[PDB]
Amino acid sequence: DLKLPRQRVDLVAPPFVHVHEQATKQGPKIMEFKLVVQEKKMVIDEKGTTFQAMTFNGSMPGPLMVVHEGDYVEVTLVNPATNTMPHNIDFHSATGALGGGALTLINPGEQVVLRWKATRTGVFVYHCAPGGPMIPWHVVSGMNGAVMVLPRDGLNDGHGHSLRYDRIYYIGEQDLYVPRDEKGNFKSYDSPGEAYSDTEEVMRKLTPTHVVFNGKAGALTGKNALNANVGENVLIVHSQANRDSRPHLIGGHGDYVWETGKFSNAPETGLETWFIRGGSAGAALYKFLQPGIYAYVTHNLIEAANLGATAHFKVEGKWNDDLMTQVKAPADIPTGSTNENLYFQ
Amino acid sequence: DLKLPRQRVDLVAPPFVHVHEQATKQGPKIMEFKLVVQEKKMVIDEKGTTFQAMTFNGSMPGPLMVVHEGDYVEVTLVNPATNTMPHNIDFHSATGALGGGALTLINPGEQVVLRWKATRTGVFVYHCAPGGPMIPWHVVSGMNGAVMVLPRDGLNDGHGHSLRYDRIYYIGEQDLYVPRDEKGNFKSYDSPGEAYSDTEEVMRKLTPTHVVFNGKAGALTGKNALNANVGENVLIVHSQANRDSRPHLIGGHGDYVWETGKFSNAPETGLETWFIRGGSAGAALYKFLQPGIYAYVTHNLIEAANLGATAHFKVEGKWNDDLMTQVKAPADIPTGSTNENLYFQ
Amino acid sequence: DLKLPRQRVDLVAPPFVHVHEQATKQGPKIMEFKLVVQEKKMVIDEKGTTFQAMTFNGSMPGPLMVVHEGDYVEVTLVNPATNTMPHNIDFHSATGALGGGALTLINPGEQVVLRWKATRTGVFVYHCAPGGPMIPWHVVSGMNGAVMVLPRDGLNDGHGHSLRYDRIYYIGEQDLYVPRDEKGNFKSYDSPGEAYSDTEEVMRKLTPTHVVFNGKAGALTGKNALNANVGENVLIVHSQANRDSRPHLIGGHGDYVWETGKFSNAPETGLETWFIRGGSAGAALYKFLQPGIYAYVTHNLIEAANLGATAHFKVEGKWNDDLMTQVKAPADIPTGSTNENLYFQ
Ligand SMILES: O=N[O-]
Ligand SMILES: O=N[O-]
Ligand SMILES: O=N[O-]
Ligand SMILES: O=N[O-]
Ligand SMILES: O=N[O-]
Ligand SMILES: O=N[O-]
Ligand SMILES: O=N[O-]
Ligand SMILES: O=N[O-]
Ligand SMILES: O=N[O-]
Ligand SMILES: [Cu+2]
Ligand SMILES: [Cu+2]
Ligand SMILES: [Cu+2]
Ligand SMILES: [Cu+2]
Ligand SMILES: [Cu+2]
Ligand SMILES: [Cu+2]
């Protein structure tokens, strides 16, 4: 019945994104994706705390899927028999059947094939949703990612001008709820089922123990900082399937930001900090103007610095002293300074 | 002095809305409403937990009032002598005197009549606000609802096109703060005054025990699901007088969303999830495209699935396989599948 | 190298703002500011609770700096040797070097001079950010303020009309994390270093003990209410460097609101409540229409009434009974009232 070309896409692990065209003159296709559920213990902080995670394709977040408006997206969801739980998938980009969840419930040892038409442009969350209390549990165990539905003509500024990125990164933010014992130390378990009761008690209090990018504190710092160059226009997709976030690029801005993440709306310009409402993806474009290290955070700085939610960019290029300069390096306060006469003393 | 026709409105219990015109060619009127405060014990979850509630017109939320720009709204607020506390009303739609609170304080056995001019379009919270710590306590005990001030020409898309709904529902979301005893079980009390001290201690920690629509977990599921039909344009008004929320229609979208709730602003288009800042109402229009069950949640899924904040729509009509289809039903993973060669293993 | 006139600005304590032009025909200048770090114990609530604070210029928030687009801002940051900790400054308005933090780290006894070009219009947070866990700690200890970068032609409505304020106020909101002892009473310390470990434990749970405007509960009530007059257009700048807020003017509205705080975007009109994402400043214009007391809150009313986050305006002028009137003062419910036949009983 649907007589369109079929194109298989090979996903890649975040924060990288599978190759794609921004603008295209190709017509609609059936874009074929495979997502394999993997339950596994994972390391989620710099002290080595482990967690009974649940993932699409082995990562937190699940990988970013990219299609264009009018494409059909045919997803083979696989639940290997080494897993212990049923799983399914809800695409916030899709129309009907709880975004697909009501058509994709699979037990370990099964797979299912769902097709949805990409009628809505933007970045959108996808996540597991088995039913009842299992919905938040699978999501906050790691079972969420995002899909981007680009306009066929690529992005624009809402005022008739095309916008093109030189580089794209996907930042999935994950709130985690890790039990502690009476001594205050994080607990370890041998299976997700064994971890559940204690984890639900932490979840109920709506305060995460960790807030991480790309699955762990420090994932996108150190050697895995995100690269860019002065002059590049970088698209930063940010998702949060369960909980609000407030992204900020330290030392930069959001030149064009779709806070609610939907490209039929013009972006806002020149933001300091934006807001990803829990259950959504948003996107920001920034053209780098200065070299050096940038931090990229949620701007609850307690979350950023103390619960894991800091990434880095390492940007190559030449410094622009017109934009910013250190006029005088740190020096002893002059002896003839008169600061004791200032109004606030 | 004010020589306009008077029109008495009979309110109805949420999530339904009293009948009204969208567009009107009638001129301004004095629209007369009566709100009667009722303090009473109410059931707020599926396990039968009770709560010492305070309400306008016996419901959480209070009923939705609907008027047009330029109408005058004359509210008779009644505090029967069976109540124990003073009460008043703040209309976020109104100008002056703390939205009316400073002109409406009534003791049990009294009533008061306030008139406010509907100069500002949108959906707006109304709530009790007696003074001091009694303000949050009366609000989170249930004393809040909403008023909609429509443009006289009805809604529009911000780009010169009229928008008309076939159906309207009012979803009032309530954060509740229910004390627990040392064994961890919710406590019961014989009066609101007796519940207050323990409730304030829960309030102070800014973590609700329950987050509910229409006054209780499960209120809008089961037999009280919200009805719609494929093709209908449904307006979903959502209020939260004290605390943020992030609404999402599972399997749908917000075609047109006034997140901040004010019709002088164009709506955003094609949202997955929107954001109701605490202390406001917002509104979303969606044209149903597929039949079946939809969930409507706050997309903190812990709140949705575990604290009470899930409603259902039951939508009649014919399924559209172009928008979404199950290409292959659940089946055993083929023996010749090669998933062990995937990049993430 | 930079051959522009230099203009020294004398800052003033919030909520007031140093004098400035809205529109200007002067060209770019080097606008010179001095900020002096002051660590000190401060009183943060109406019961006299003290706190080991860290400030710019002795206040929470730090003072509002005002410049125009294209100016250069040359900041001398001073860390007197009476302080105990290193400090620095991040301007969210600036481009490069972590907003300046990477060029301004100074030990007690030192000062540094940073210049940044004001290329981005709006209101923006500035805050200390020494590194690692010290970043949130210095911020939530009080080391944050804001800078406003006005367009050279002043504000406009996004639709080609100039907007001019008669009056400006800066409301800095501060989330505080004050330890308690086993008896539940706030603890006192002799230095910030001594307070740190216990404070970090409170911070980690992401629930403030206090949420205050201008540094303390009650700061902007009583004799320090904010003054205005009927007819004045008042700009209310609101910042929150670490945590979301939802401002609301009780009895008023936001006529024009830049929620994300950036003047290249048109303001929203007629808001009831707006949203300051943590890590940002926003701004609202309101033309007062009625005299009397107004409250200005975050509309988590628990925070507003119970944790400190209420300010007042005292507005002089004549009451407008067309906008609002008390039709009938409180009176006993008429004996012939029939409220027992209402639908909700
Ligand atoms: O150690 N993780 O369960
Ligand atoms: O669920 N959000 O903060
Ligand atoms: O601006 N750095 O938090
Ligand atoms: O049982 N409610 O107080
Ligand atoms: O008060 N809001 O999350
Ligand atoms: O999309 N359902 O959470
Ligand atoms: O009393 N303050 O540390
Ligand atoms: O960090 N904000 O609620
Ligand atoms: O509208 N006063 O919360
Ligand atoms: Cu799952
Ligand atoms: Cu969802
Ligand atoms: Cu009341
Ligand atoms: Cu209010
Ligand atoms: Cu500091
Ligand atoms: Cu910052």
Concatenating the DSSP letter of every residue in B194-212 gives: HHHHHHHHHHHTT--SEEE
Residue A162 sits in the same domain as residue A302: yes
From B121, B151, B181, the end of a domain falls on B151
What are the pocket residues of ligand 6 if the criterion is a CB atom closer than 6 Å to any ligand atom?
A 90, 92, 99, 129; B 250
Q: Chain C 309-328, CB below 8 Å of chain A: which residues?
A: none
Ligand 2 nearest-atom number relative to CA A242: 1
In a domain, C325, yes or no: no
In a domain, B329, yes or no: no
Q: Chain C 245-304, CB below 8 Å of chain B: which residues?
A: 246, 248, 250-253, 259, 268-275, 289-290, 292-295, 299-304
Would you call B81 exposed, middle or buried from its count of C-beta atoms within 10 A (0-12, 13-18, 19+)? exposed
Chain A residues lying within 8 Å of C122, measured CB to CB: 270, 272
Residue B139 sits in the same domain as residue B194: no
Contact A106, A79 (CB under 8 A): yes
Residue C110 sits in the same domain as residue C175: no
Contact B83, B56 (CB under 8 A): no
The position carrying tokens 């002043």 is C154
Q: What residues contact A48, with CB distance under 8 A and at least 6 apart?
A: none
In a domain, B345, yes or no: no
Q: Which tokens sit at C263?
A: 């003047």
Residue A17 sits in the same domain as residue A98: yes
Q: Chain B 192-231, CB below 8 Å of chain A: which residues?
A: 207
Q: Is B345 on the interface with A (CB under 8 A)?
A: yes
* Cβ neighbours, 10 Å, residue B280: 31
Residue A93 sits in the same domain as residue A162: no
Task: Let me know if B210 is a catalytic residue.
Answer: no
First to last CA, chain B: 79
3-state secondary structure of A252: coil
Residue C7 sits in the same domain as residue C65: yes
Of A109, A203, A280, the CB nearest to B273: A280
Residue B200 sits in the same domain as residue B296: yes
Q: Which tokens sit at C334?
A: 């008429």
* Cβ neighbours, 10 Å, residue C4: 13
Q: How many domains does chain B have?
A: 2
The residue whose CA is least distant from atom 3 of ligand 9 is C250
Q: Which tokens sit at A292?
A: 């050096």
Task: Give the neighbours of chain A: at least 3 Cβ pairs within 8 Å.
Answer: B, C
3-state secondary structure of C224: helix
Residue C162 sits in the same domain as residue C247: yes
DSSP state of C335: T
Interface test with C, best of A256, A260, A325, A342 (most C CBs within 10 A): A325
Task: Let me know if B55 is a catalytic residue.
Answer: no
Chain A residues lying within 8 Å of C13, measured CB to CB: 343-344
Provide the residue range defining the domain that includes C58: 1-151
In a domain, B304, yes or no: yes
From A151, A168, A194, the end of a domain falls on A151
3-state secondary structure of A157: coil
In a domain, A100, yes or no: yes
Please tell me the distance between residue C301's alpha carbon and the centre of ligand 5 in angstroms: 9
Residues measured by CB to lie within 5 Å of ligand 10, the ion: A 87, 128, 138, 143
Task: Let me know if A273 is a catalytic residue.
Answer: yes
The position carrying tokens 């549990």 is A137
* Cβ neighbours, 10 Å, residue A187: 13
In a domain, A344, yes or no: no
3-state secondary structure of C21: coil
The position carrying tokens 């809604």 is B155
Please give the method by which this entry was determined. X-ray
The residue whose CA is least distant from atom 3 of ligand 3 is A250
Contact B80, B55 (CB under 8 A): no
Strand-pair category, A110-117 with A72-79: antiparallel
- Sign of dihedral through CA atoms B2, B8, B13, B16? negative
Distance CA B224, CA B205 (A): 33
Residue A122 sits in the same domain as residue A259: no
Residue B67's closest CA among B4, B8, B128? B8
In a domain, C342, yes or no: no
The position carrying tokens 């709560």 is B51
Distance CA A91, CA A124 (A): 8
Phi-psi map region of A328: left, alpha, beta (phi>0 left; psi -120 to 50 alpha): beta
Distance CA A217, CA A42 (A): 12
In a domain, A331, yes or no: no
Contact C57, C33 (CB under 8 A): no
Q: Is B83 on the interface with C (CB under 8 A)?
A: no
Strand partners, B51: B42
Q: Which residues of A define the annotated binding site for Cu(2+)?
A: 87, 90, 92, 127-128, 138, 143, 299
DSSP state of C107: -
From B117, B151, B185, the end of a domain falls on B151
Residue B75 sits in the same domain as residue B95: yes
- Which residues of C have a catalytic role annotated? 87, 90, 92, 127-128, 138, 143, 248, 272-273, 299
3-state secondary structure of B224: helix
Ligand 9 nearest-atom number relative to CA C295: 2
What are the pocket residues of ligand 8 if the criterion is a CB atom closer than 6 Å to any ligand atom?
A 300; C 243-244, 278
3-state secondary structure of C101: helix
- Sign of dihedral through CA atoms A191, A197, A198, A201? positive
Residue B160 sits in the same domain as residue B308: yes
Cα B67 vs. chain centroid, distance in angstroms? 17
Residue C59 sits in the same domain as residue C165: no
Q: What residues contact A102, with CB distance under 8 A and at least 6 apart?
A: A88, B251, B292, B293
